[PDB]
Design a protein around this ligand. Structure first.
Ligand code: ZN
Lengths: 166, 108, 144
RNA sequence: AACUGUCUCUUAUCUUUAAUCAGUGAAAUUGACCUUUCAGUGAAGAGGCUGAAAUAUAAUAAUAAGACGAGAAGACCCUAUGGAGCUUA
RNA sequence: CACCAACUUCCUAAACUUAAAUUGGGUUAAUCUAUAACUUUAUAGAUGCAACACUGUUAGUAUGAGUAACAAGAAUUCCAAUUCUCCAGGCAUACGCGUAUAACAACUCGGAUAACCAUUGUUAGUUAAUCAGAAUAGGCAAUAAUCACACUAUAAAUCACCUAUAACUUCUCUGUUAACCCAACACCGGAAUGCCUAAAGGAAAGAUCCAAAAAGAUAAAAGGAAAAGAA
């Protein structure tokens, strides 16, 4: 087993100089053993990526999946330690920078059948990894306009270089 | 039924990451002034509703003890009175339930 | 016009009979939203039977069958019926409650008899007229 | 022979299934695949060759009539100046 | 009235002629020994010394697939709480099992999913003079039962007690729990006997929707094989 996500939370940066900008806080929190499928947890993780702390909590509160309840507890724990240990002044000033799920060690059993058949029973466990960055979520992407696309095409034509000639 | 060959993770990754299969966000979340907790616009607050049910259970418990037997539902109206409030003439001809607690602020 | 409930038509009425009996005894019942809506019509019509009169022989047969506990029969004609004499309808108040966290996520609702002695339910409140938008609408109303 | 929804000739309701939510979780299978249509070529024979044609990406939902469908050492019968075994007085 | 096109050919640098069993010759990865080297090497001597392929063997992890698949009567005043709706083989002993018993504490594993425990840990338990299990030698015996009488029958069906000898005052030991056993299972069936048929024993509903198709059941305007009778 590897527990390097916690070690990422143990990273200590060098003292910042007075003429150095305040470093945004980064919090690494994970739940190593969850009796849940990582794929199902990943779906929850994918949606919440990049959202604010408050928005994620509100969405989770009205979610019907068991994994969502687990994430909310994990999210609440991460927020508590972030203020307690990572010097997060404002509770609201937190957003989900990263959210992903990993496989966990399972259990092996045989599934009996009533009529002499048998099956492979497996008890699934998973890991859940989240990194929280202090501050509001980054602004969303803006689609390219027609003007932007057209300009690039002309630039590409100009950028073309002649091939295999003097 | 199995495909004639193993399904590649690349193929599988695209299927599960298609937007149709992803979890959707909800924008109907609302705040409950009464409890100060979250609620849905079409759903009532449960923190305050929990108080009503808990008081109802306490009121029901008092009624059960007063009746003292099964199938003893009165044929007369019922009323609930709290400490500091005494039965009045208007309460005559109505079953009176006495509560040791004082009249709750929310309950009128 | 009817929800397909119960192992058979009798079960729905018997289940409705069980639901109706409990509501009369307690006057406020929490159940799945679909059941509460289905039984709301029966409860309102039962109150009309109480209004019809205690002497009504047909009402007794309906009341006797629907209410398994017979102590409620005097209550309906002497408590529920007198209570709702002024009212012309809407005797039952049904509201949606958050779904049960019992791993099945059933839709929940609470149905109660109006005029009951139980504490008032936390009903929704419309916006006050003192709000800026309402105050602006008030000015338009005054001019007209 | 009658009888009846067996049928002429189907319809309706109830139950199961069905569909949605949540929890749990197998099996045969699997060279790799960025996995199209038409004509040709070939061993009855082409998603992958030749030449034409079509073609945002990703998904989602339905049906088994025909190709006298594809097939095996399935099924069936008969043969041998074939073998070998067996019985002998 | 030409051009294109092969390493055919020419040209600069080079090179010196075109299938496959079989046959001659030169190297080499790795490990160890002898003797050296000293960021991983040399000369000799050795070998369990190199695997995409033996119906090869072991372990890990995928695919099918989060697919097949699976589950608890209602309300409340509450899981050793009440009441309501509905179901109808129950209780003892034998055999077997062997603590699965009960209380408490846990909520991970086990229940073919949970709740709840039958799982996990701790402690307790099943009380017997009555229930159950754990001297000798001789002599001498015709006639079934069937309410045994009548009555017949064939299929043929009953130690004792006498005579002697010997002993000479006793209640311990063991079984006793349970929803239990044999079927790989909390199996669907297998499992001896007595009593009795609800007073005993129980719950078909994880939720929502009311798709189609499919399965079972009920109903049919007019008709009646496109009632149970004959050959
Ligand atoms: Zn509130």
């Amino acid at each position: 087993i590897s527990r390097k996500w916690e070690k990422k939370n143990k990273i200590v940066y060098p003292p910042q100089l007075p003429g150095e900008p305040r470093r945004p806080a980064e919090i690494y929190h994970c739940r190593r053993q969850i009796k849940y499928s990582k794929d199902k947890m990943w779906y929850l993780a994918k949606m919440i990526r990049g959202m604010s702390i408050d928005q994620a909590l509100a969405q989770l509160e009205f979610n019907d999946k068991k994994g969502a309840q687990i994430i909310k507890e994990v999210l609440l724990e991460a927020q508590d330690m972030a203020v307690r240990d990572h010097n997060v002044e404002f509770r609201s000033n937190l957003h989900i920078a990263e959210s992903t799920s990993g496989r966990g060690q399972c259990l092996k059993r045989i599934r009996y059948h009533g009529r002499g058949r048998f099956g492979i029973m497996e008890k699934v466990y998973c890991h859940y990894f989240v990194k929280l960055v202090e501050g509001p979520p980054p602004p969303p992407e803006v689609p390219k306009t027609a003007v932007d696309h057209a300009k690039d095409y002309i630039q590409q034509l100009r950028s073309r270089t002649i091939i295999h000639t003097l | 039924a199995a495909p004639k060959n193993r399904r590649t993770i690349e193929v599988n990754r695209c299927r599960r990451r298609n937007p149709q299969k992803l979890i959707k966000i909800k924008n109907n979340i609302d705040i409950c002034p009464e409890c100060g907790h979250l609620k849905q616009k079409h759903v009532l607050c449960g923190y305050c509703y929990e108080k009503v049910r808990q008081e109802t259970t306490k009121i029901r418990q008092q009624i059960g003890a007063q009746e003292g037997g099964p199938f003893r539902a009165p044929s007369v109206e019922t009323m609930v009175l709290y400490t500091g409030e005494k039965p009045s003439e208007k309460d005559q001809g109505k079953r009176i339930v006495e509560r040791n607690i004082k009249r709750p602020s929310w309950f009128t | 016009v009817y929800r397909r409930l119960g192992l058979g038509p009798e079960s729905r009425i018997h289940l409705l009979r069980n639901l109706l009996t409990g509501l009369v005894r307690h006057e406020r019942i929490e159940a799945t939203w679909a059941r509460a809506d289905e039984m709301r019509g029966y409860a309102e019509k039962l109150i009309d039977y109480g209004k019809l009169g205690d002497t009504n022989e047909r009402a007794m047969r309906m009341a006797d069958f629907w209410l398994t506990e017979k102590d409620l029969i005097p209550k309906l004609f002497k408590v529920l019926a007198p209570r709702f004499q002024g009212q012309n309808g809407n005797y039952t108040r049904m509201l949606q409650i958050p779904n049960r966290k019992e791993q099945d996520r059933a839709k929940m609702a609470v149905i109660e008899y109006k005029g009951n002695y139980l504490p008032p339910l936390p009903l929704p409140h419309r916006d006050s007229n003192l709000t800026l938008l309402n105050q602006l609408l008030l000015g338009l109303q005054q001019d007209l």
